[PDB]
Amino acid sequence: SIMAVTFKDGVILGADSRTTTGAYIANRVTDKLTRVHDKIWCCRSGSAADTQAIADIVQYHLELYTSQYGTPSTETAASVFKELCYENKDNLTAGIIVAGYDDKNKGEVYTIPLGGSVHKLPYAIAGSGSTFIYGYCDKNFRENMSKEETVDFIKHSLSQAIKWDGSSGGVIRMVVLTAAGVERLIFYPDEYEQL
Amino acid sequence: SIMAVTFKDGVILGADSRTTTGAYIANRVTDKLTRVHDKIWCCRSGSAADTQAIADIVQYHLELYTSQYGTPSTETAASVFKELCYENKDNLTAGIIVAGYDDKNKGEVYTIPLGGSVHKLPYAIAGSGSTFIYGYCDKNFRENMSKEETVDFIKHSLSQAIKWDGSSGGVIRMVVLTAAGVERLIFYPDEYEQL
Amino acid sequence: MDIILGIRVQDSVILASSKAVTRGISVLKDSDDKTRQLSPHTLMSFAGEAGDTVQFAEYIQANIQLYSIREDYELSPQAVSSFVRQELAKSIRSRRPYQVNVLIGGYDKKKNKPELYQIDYLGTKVELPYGAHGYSGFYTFSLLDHHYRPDMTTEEGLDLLKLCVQELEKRMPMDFKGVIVKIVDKDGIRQVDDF
Amino acid sequence: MDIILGIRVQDSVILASSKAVTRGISVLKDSDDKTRQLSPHTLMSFAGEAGDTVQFAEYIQANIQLYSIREDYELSPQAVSSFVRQELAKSIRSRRPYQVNVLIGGYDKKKNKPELYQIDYLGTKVELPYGAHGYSGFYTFSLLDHHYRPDMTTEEGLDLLKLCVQELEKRMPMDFKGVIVKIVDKDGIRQVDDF
Amino acid sequence: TMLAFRFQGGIIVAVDSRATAGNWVASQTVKKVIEINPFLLGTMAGGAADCQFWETWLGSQCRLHELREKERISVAAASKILSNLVYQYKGAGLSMGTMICGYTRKEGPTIYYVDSDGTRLKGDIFCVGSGQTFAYGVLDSNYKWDLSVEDALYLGKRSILAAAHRDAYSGGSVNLYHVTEDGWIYHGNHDVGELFWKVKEEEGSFNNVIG
Amino acid sequence: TQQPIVTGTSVISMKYDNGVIIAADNLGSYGSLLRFNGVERLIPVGDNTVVGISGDISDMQHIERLLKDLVTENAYDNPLADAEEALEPSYIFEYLATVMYQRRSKMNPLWNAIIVAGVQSNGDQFLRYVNLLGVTYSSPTLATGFGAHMANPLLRKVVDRESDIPKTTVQVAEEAIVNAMRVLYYRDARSSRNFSLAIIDKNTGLTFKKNLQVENMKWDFAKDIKGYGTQKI
Amino acid sequence: XAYX
Amino acid sequence: XAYX
Amino acid sequence: XAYX
Amino acid sequence: XAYX
Amino acid sequence: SDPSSINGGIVVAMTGKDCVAIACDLRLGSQSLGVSNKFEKIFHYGHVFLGITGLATDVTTLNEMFRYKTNLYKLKEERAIEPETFTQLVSSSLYERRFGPYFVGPVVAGINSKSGKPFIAGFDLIGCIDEAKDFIVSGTASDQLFGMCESLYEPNLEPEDLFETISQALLNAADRDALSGWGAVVYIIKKDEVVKRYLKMRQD
Amino acid sequence: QFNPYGDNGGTILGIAGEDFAVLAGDTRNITDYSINSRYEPKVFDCGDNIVMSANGFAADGDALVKRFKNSVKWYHFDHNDKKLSINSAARNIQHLLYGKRFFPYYVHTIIAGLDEDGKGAVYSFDPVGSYEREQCRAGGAAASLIMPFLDNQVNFKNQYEPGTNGKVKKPLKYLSVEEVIKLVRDSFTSATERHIQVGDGLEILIVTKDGVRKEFYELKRD
Amino acid sequence: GYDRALSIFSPDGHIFQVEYALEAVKRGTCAVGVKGKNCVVLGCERRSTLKLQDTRITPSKVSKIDSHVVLSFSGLNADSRILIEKARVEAQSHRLTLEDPVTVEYLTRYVAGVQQRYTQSGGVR
Amino acid sequence: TIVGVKFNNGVVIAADTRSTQGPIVADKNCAKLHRISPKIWCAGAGTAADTEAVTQLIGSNIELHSLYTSREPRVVSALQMLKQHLFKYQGHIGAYLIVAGVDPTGSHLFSIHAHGSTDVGYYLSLGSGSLAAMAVLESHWKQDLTKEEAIKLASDAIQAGIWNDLGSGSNVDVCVMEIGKDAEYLRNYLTPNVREEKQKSYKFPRGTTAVLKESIVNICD
Ligand SMILES: [Mg+2]
Ligand SMILES: [Mg+2]
Ligand SMILES: [Mg+2]
Ligand SMILES: [Mg+2]
Ligand SMILES: [Mg+2]
Ligand SMILES: [Mg+2]
């Protein structure tokens, strides 16, 4: 279960920590939030191997972009992801959310489903556990939320996604992208379960 | 998208009105709330033909039960549904919610999934569109709600289920079961869509 | 099994039937008589699935012999053929059908005429001047179309039959180890020992 | 194609090869020579997939004839067999392998010894006193095990071969229209015209 | 249905003219003989296009041979160009049953059977097609080396008529050819519509049929 | 070999006396899930052509880029890029029609059904269809998916043949389209209420209408319907 | 089929 | 496709 | 495999 | 089968 | 292994002025192999005519079955069965074998002895009745027969004219089908005389 | 799995006279049970008095016609504006079709025009390039309905001289353009009645030495 | 690949590389061919500055291309082996496709064609 | 293409008259409007024999029921008997029916699918042309239709199927079931697909057909 939400000061990425090989949890403390650039992160859903290989290539492309043309836009990062996902759609199972913070464009969220299509949204949810929180997220999401409101929104949303989805669980990792910098957050079962 | 919710004065059944043959809507004003007894109704999901044939047999069994032993319990009604669904599980695709009002037991809700298992719950959701409102319904459901609160809870819940599920839509029918009697409610798109 | 031929001439019916019984890559027998006498003036040759052929032939033989004893009277070739056809017509819609093709050569003592009936395993009956079952037909029919005359003697019929066996021995892939020839006429059934 | 035999005796190698070419339910030809002379003292019989057999035989023949002209020298039967085996060993892992089995009968002029090599389409080579390909072996091998002696004359070898053809003509399902017999000895290759 | 046999007076070649699209009769007027050169004939059995296209192409290769070598191609070399071609396409699904018939000085009257699975056979008598067995039946039982040109032409025509009658996928008309030392001679188109009744009456054969 | 993932439903269009109208809802379905609600499936090329696309949205976004790139390429070394040598609907169509057939011929199709609606330089109405198979056809009315089954019958009551086009006004034609879009909302399980509509007129030019909604819907009669037969209550 |  |  |  |  | 196209064959029926015509080919084969050129597909029970195409074993079986039933009908009713009634009997009998059907295409033809009205009807293998004013077609060349009948047919033809129209409809349809032909029979049916003509057609 | 072929239905018909030739086809284009167009022509003037139709899968049909039209254009460039004879056009099309033997054009192709003696000519092709000259050919969905009618009315098959005991056949003779168009119109109206994929409209292209003329006729739209 | 046009025209219309190749032939040991009524004889010179030679194993001057055709030469010995090998392969290739050994004219025409190809191919002398 | 439309004082059903076998039109004027009882009529789509056979069987059992109870049969009885029959055969009887009629209870309109599911409605359509028809019904239907308005809407919905659906064609059959009146069956209510005059008469000169044998057939006893 993964989501990225834009708010007043920028954007927050959130994800569960569960990796499954069938009904067996191969890793219960997985980090599904990956940094492709200083303030451009992505949420990985689908094949761990596919999303890993894509994210590594994108990180390489944006590092080489930065060397030549300076800091890339979040839109540029999403375009590189799309280009890989779309052109290799037959051999890939990757659903990726791209979230980044510009100073001009502030917080932006691009979702890339299986097809390899791009969708720019105020907030995005994805992964097996996202199906259970479409209703909740649509009713509770507001534009220009505060940091604390957005953290609560993601925490409550993923809490429900984890509760119903067997494929989701463990800790809720979050990554806050603002002008201030990059902040990593973690939330343990004992907290979010009894929300 | 179907649900039944217990509250202070009894129980309310709710459902969408959409019947699909693939992506074609065969009936957009379907009545998926069926009376098996005066104050025992059921919510039908799965094969229209299977759920129809089952509901007709249950109505027959409870009519014959009433002739001999007087008014059957809601538990008895659910047992007859289970007995048909469980013993013919190989040939049936029926997910049925049974809801009834006794004067002793007040409002009761029994859900019968595909397997033919019985689950007595405070409230139950089922059908393709139920997946999208597990998060919402779990966060918003309270025990001993008022009639108006319960109607709003069902209206908002099915509103979201309809919004996300292509297999759900049309009007929201509801049936209120209390000591007062039986009340039929209908809610049109122009109202619930803009909730 | 494989090769069974039949030629109706002026005053007799001649049946030629291959002597080979093959299973796998071994010719188990080279002297097999693929015929049963149903009545003194009626002979049935057979070919098809192993076991089924003899089991069916003997079953028919028993039924005709039972009729002969009961009525102290020989059934006409036409009557026997109709009986056999009906048995195969029943068979084809059974749980396990008889996979047996037959020729019925008979001399009608009331009409003083030879009669040849070709019946496949489906129960498809035809009266013919000359008949064959299996791949045999694909050679013999065109040959007989040319050389056959309706007013031929038994000796002329045997020479016409020799011409068919020679053609089959030349162009057929499998060694069928020659044929047993039998003549059906006014004086009954006799076997040609030197062919 | 089908029946190819080989018998190495004291002073010669004898190859017997069936004359029938069958396609479908028709024997197209009954005088086919299923052999090529590779060199004056080396003969290769062949059997297998239609087209592949002759295409492969003539290809080998061309290569050995090219070697003979280049070096003005005849390759030993052992050398030719090894060359043929390697060609088939390559073939089996090709896009479309040669489905051809061969016997190579040769007289080594340096050793003054007859040599018989059996090579299947996989490139499985064995030197044998007597060899066969296809179903032929299942009859001839046990017969030769009994009657074969290593010190036999060419005339004794032909009588031993007649015994094999008689057994095959008796028990083989298919008519292979007799055999062309060829003898390889110190004086080269000659064909027995009356067999 | 098509046949080609060698005899005392050269080669007879006879074919039917029916084209089938399953149980649909596409044509009754099909040319199943291609005239490659005055001394070479090609019979087309199998894929209508496969046979037509590659035997027309064979005729181009035979023309290039006599330009390059200043000498008419041998029946053996002509047949082997076609057999070596189809063998390259083996497994790709080409459908071709072909008899290459012709006369040369060095070879004399020669017939080569060539099919799509690469088989190439020299032989005196060949019958090819869905009705091959029906034609073989009549041809084999009446064939002698010492047949006259008149009798040989009739046997070829009669053998096709036999197959045209029995085989559902054979019929239309008979196209006759005679090949001598001087080259090939066309012996006309014979509609089975008229030929059958003419043969039945005159020969006294086909007694199975309601006269 | 593909399977479509995020999909767009019906695109409907028709000719009228002076030009053409085309419409398509703003939904990106993910199977039965109505996942994306802000999707534009009408893409204008210049001021005289609109391309309506149904089927795979990832493939639609690829076609968007090709058309955007086509406009750029046409402007190169072209002083009459906004005049005589401007992109025609017929040029844009034939380009896509070429691409669609090439991709099907390489067994790697663009999983789309496309309608190119526009007005040529000489005032003639252009309306032509092409799909993943490279199949092309033209008709007074064209529609994709459910539109073909439900819209075409309604639009053909207005313009049944060629002679009906001069007799059809933009007011009548637009009314028929908006009515068709409502019917598709009633009966297509992968449709949305929100849609876009484009008019290309030979006089008033390209009018692009966004954020339209299906309205004047009949649901009231639903209140009277009970059970499936014998149920009185 | 008919089948919420 | 046609195919005697 | 590994696969939220 | 015959089959509006 | 398609039961309707193993044996092959065709039947066609037409209406004229105070008359009906029913015609059939004579071929019976085993796929490519022609076996019999004497296999008639038209039978009659009194004045009611029935043509049956399809699997030959079922053609023979159904003839024997309808002979059985019309014989008992006549003994009990003390009158010959009429075409309209017989049509209903065929439909009943076929639908009785709904989930194990006879692989046949039957065609009823005859004149009602009471009203004098010409009557024809066709059925699918499962018993669906196809009543028609003009013509009925059945068999492996049904497409061909449909194309011939639809173009050649005109209403109120005299028996002598109707014979030519049906004969040409069958012959030219049969010559474009591999599994049909090998001889043909035409029944011209008037109120109280029936003429049966064997046609000369190409035997390939 | 992706299926690269489809069936656009419709039917086509080519008849050859003494000094003319017609190539007719219905204007209906369909997929499954839906009508795509009531007027989508599929009989084209390709220049040099050659008319061509490739009926079946429209995408393959349009691709082939487009490639042949282009073939005619390059024949002019490469061979000094020489007129492409109907026999030469036929052979050229065989090579186009067979060029995709292992991924065919799903079309029954027919061309019509005049031979080099000025006489009416019709050539018909299978999907893989087998071709034959004929007086008469129907192609497409309703070919099986029309073709046996043409055999009877054009080539006078199964028609014997009255009173000759079925011994003398009806003599073959060329038909007038008026008589041929009657047969075409009756062929299509009959086909329209009994085939669901045939109707809407009939477009006939007539080829004389004077050039290519067109005629259009309404058909039933059900 | 080495592309250089080594065989090219000179102002006077000569291809010097071809003419210099003839000079190599003129340097080579004498070879003579005489054909009689029913035979051909190939005579070949062997220079006598080489004593202590092994005539058993030393390449013979006359080479069999097939059982019925022979090839003698004058010029570079190493070059002759390449022509002989190609000719021998074409001899077996002809037997395989035409089912008939080469004519002497055909085998000559092939060898002459190979020699010609090396006079207007890039990177070769 | 079959439709059912409810109006003021009853119900109307309509159908096309085309029967198909693959792409071939088997029957150009078949009747898909079936009588279960005098005032209960059924429109049938799917397997032609199944719609006829199941309509006659229930129609027979309804007649026997009507005689047994001394009461005019009800639509819900025909609905219950049809759906329980179809359900028993798990869709293997491919009958898709629009059941409509008037009885002592009032006027009724139902649809039945082959698997045994039943719907209720004021306007319904079934068959291959159901989407063409339903498009027209959804466009023009309103509450409180008159008899003449309902027939027009019904026949218009069938016409949509005839023209736009290849599975539907030829003519329009209508049956009007009004309360207190006899049901009027309007066979070929519209015939908008009349075959145009042929260009030529194909009447052959007599003796054209070659004949081998003639014989008089004995039909008498
Ligand atoms: Mg919805
Ligand atoms: Mg081995
Ligand atoms: Mg035949
Ligand atoms: Mg065939
Ligand atoms: Mg025929
Ligand atoms: Mg039509």
Is the minimum CB–CB distance between G2 and chain N shorter than 8 Å? yes
User: Which residues are bridge partners to L166 per DSSP?
Assistant: none
* Domain ranges, residue K199: 1-204
d(CA M61, CA M55) in angstroms, rounded, equals 11
Q: Give how far Cα L142 sits from Cα of F208, K114, L148, N162, N179, Å.
A: 44, 41, 11, 20, 48
Q: Respond yes or no: is residue F1 known to be catalytic.
A: yes
Q: How many domains does chain K have?
A: 1
d(CA N136, CA N156) in angstroms, rounded, equals 7
User: Which residues are bridge partners to D16 per DSSP?
Assistant: D5, D181
Method: X-ray
C-beta atoms surrounding C27 within 10 Å? 20
CB of A80 closer than 8 Å to CB of A61: yes
Ligand nearest to the CA of B167: 1
Positive or negative, the CA dihedral K15, K20, K21, K22 is positive
Please report, for chain L, the start and end positions of each structural domain, with discontinuous segments joined by +: 1-222
Nearest CA in chain C to K26: C126
3-state secondary structure of A194: coil
Token pair 């890559």 is found at C25
C-beta atoms surrounding A161 within 10 Å? 31
Asked if N210 and L220 come within 8 Å (Cβ–Cβ), the reply is no
- Structure letter (DSSP) for residue L79: T
Q: Which two tokens stand for residue N113?
A: 């699918």
Ligand 5 centre distance from Cα of residue E168 (Å): 7
Shortest Cα distance, chain J CAs vs residue K198, angstroms: 31
Residue L66: burial class (beta carbons within 10 Å; 0-12, 13-18, 19+): middle
Where b means 16+ CB within 10 Å and e means fewer, B155-183 reads bbbbbbbbbbbbbbbbbbbbbbbbeeeee
Please report, for chain C, the start and end positions of each structural domain, with discontinuous segments joined by +: 1-195
CATH number of C1-195: 3.60.20.10
Shortest Cα distance, chain M CAs vs residue E80, angstroms: 6
| Closest Cβ–Cβ partner in L162, L189, L220 for N205 | L162
Token pair 């340097």 is found at M27
Is the minimum CB–CB distance between M91 and chain D shorter than 8 Å? yes
Nearest CA in chain N to G3: N117
Shortest Cα distance, chain A CAs vs residue I2, angstroms: 5
| CATH top class, domain F1-233 | alpha beta
Q: Name every chain F residue with its beta carbon within 8 A of the beta carbon of N121.
A: 225
User: Which residues are bridge partners to B11 per DSSP?
Assistant: B6, B177
**Of the candidates K99, K97, K81, the residue with the CA atom closest to the CA atom of residue K89:** K81
**Of the candidates A2, A27, A14, A35, the residue with the CA atom closest to the CA atom of residue A125:** A2
Q: Give how far Cα M20 sits from Cα of B127, J2, L197, M2, M23, Å.
A: 94, 89, 78, 21, 5
CATH number at residue K130: 3.60.20.10
Ligand 1 centre distance from Cα of residue E136 (Å): 71
Model resolution, angstroms? 2.8
Token pair 């019509």 is found at L112
3-state secondary structure of M86: helix
| Closest Cβ–Cβ partner in K148, K200, K202 for L148 | K148
Nearest CA in chain C to K62: C89
What is the architecture of the domain spanning L1-222?
4-Layer Sandwich (3.60)
Positive or negative, the CA dihedral C141, C142, C144, C149 is positive
Asked if E90 and D25 come within 8 Å (Cβ–Cβ), the reply is no
A–C touching, 3+ CB–CB pairs within 8 Å? no
CB of K171 closer than 8 Å to CB of N209: yes
B–G touching, 3+ CB–CB pairs within 8 Å? yes
Q: Give how far Cα E45 sits from Cα of D32, D49, E154, K168, Å.
A: 23, 21, 22, 32
Q: Give how far Cα B83 sits from Cα of B76, B87, B94, B115, Å.
A: 11, 6, 13, 11
Ligand 6 centre distance from Cα of residue L188 (Å): 10
E164 annotated as ligand-binding? no
CB of L7 closer than 8 Å to CB of L33: no
Asked if E165 and K38 come within 8 Å (Cβ–Cβ), the reply is no
Beta-carbon contacts of residue M40 (< 8 Å; ≥ 6 apart): M33, M34
d(CA B5, CA B143) in angstroms, rounded, equals 9
Ligand 2 centre distance from Cα of residue D109 (Å): 25
d(CA M99, CA M109) in angstroms, rounded, equals 19
Torsion of the alpha carbons at M50, M55, M60 and M66, rounded to the nearest 10: 180
3-state secondary structure A40-91: EEEEEEECHHHHHHHHHHHHHHHHHHHHHHCCCCHHHHHHHHHHHHHHCCCC
3-state secondary structure of E202: helix
Q: Give how far Cα K12 sits from Cα of K46, L153, N202, Å.
A: 20, 20, 18
Ligand 5 centre distance from Cα of residue K27 (Å): 9
C-beta atoms surrounding B41 within 10 Å? 26
Token pair 């249950």 is found at B58
| Closest Cβ–Cβ partner in K34, K140, K182 for E23 | K140
| Closest Cβ–Cβ partner in L141, L153, L186 for N23 | L141
CB of D133 closer than 8 Å to CB of D146: no
User: Which residues are bridge partners to D109 per DSSP?
Assistant: none
Nearest CA in chain D to M64: D69
Phi, psi of L33 (to 5 degrees): -110, 5
Half-sphere exposure of K31 (CA within 13 A, CB side): 9
Neighbours of chain B (3+ CB pairs under 8 A): A, F, G, N
User: Which residues are bridge partners to B100 per DSSP?
Assistant: B40, B108
CB of B100 closer than 8 Å to CB of B80: no
Torsion of the alpha carbons at D58, D61, D67 and D70, rounded to the nearest 10: -70
Name the maximum alpha-carbon separation found in chain I: 14
CB of K199 closer than 8 Å to CB of K44: no
Nearest CA in chain G to B171: G4
Chain E residues interacting with chain D (CB cutoff of 8 angstroms): 83, 87, 90-91, 113, 115, 117-121, 123, 126-127, 132-133, 136
Beta-carbon contacts of residue C143 (< 8 Å; ≥ 6 apart): C163, C164, C167, E137, E138, E141
Question: Which long-range CB contacts under 8 A does B63-67 form with residues at least 24 apart?
Answer: B63/B37, B66/B37
Q: Give how far Cα F133 sits from Cα of C134, E185, L25, L31, Å.
A: 46, 50, 23, 12
CB of E195 closer than 8 Å to CB of E161: yes
Q: Which two tokens stand for residue C176?
A: 């069928």
d(CA E120, CA E99) in angstroms, rounded, equals 9
For A119-139, give the DSSP string: EEESEEEESGGGGGGHHHHHH
Is the minimum CB–CB distance between A156 and chain B shorter than 8 Å? yes
E–C touching, 3+ CB–CB pairs within 8 Å? yes
Shortest Cα distance, chain B CAs vs residue A42, angstroms: 24
C-beta atoms surrounding F205 within 10 Å? 12
d(CA N67, CA E23) in angstroms, rounded, equals 54
Question: What is the phi-psi region of residue B46: left when phi exceeds 0, alpha when psi lies from -120 to 50, beta otherwise?
Answer: left
| Closest Cβ–Cβ partner in D25, D30, D171 for C26 | D171
CB of N82 closer than 8 Å to CB of N98: no
What residues 65-94 of chain B have any CB closer than 8 A to a CB of chain A? Answer: none
**Of the candidates B62, B150, B139, the residue with the CA atom closest to the CA atom of residue B98:** B62
Q: Give how far Cα C131 sits from Cα of C114, C127, C161, K122, M92, Å.
A: 14, 9, 12, 33, 55
CB of K1 closer than 8 Å to CB of K142: no
Ligand nearest to the CA of B129: 1
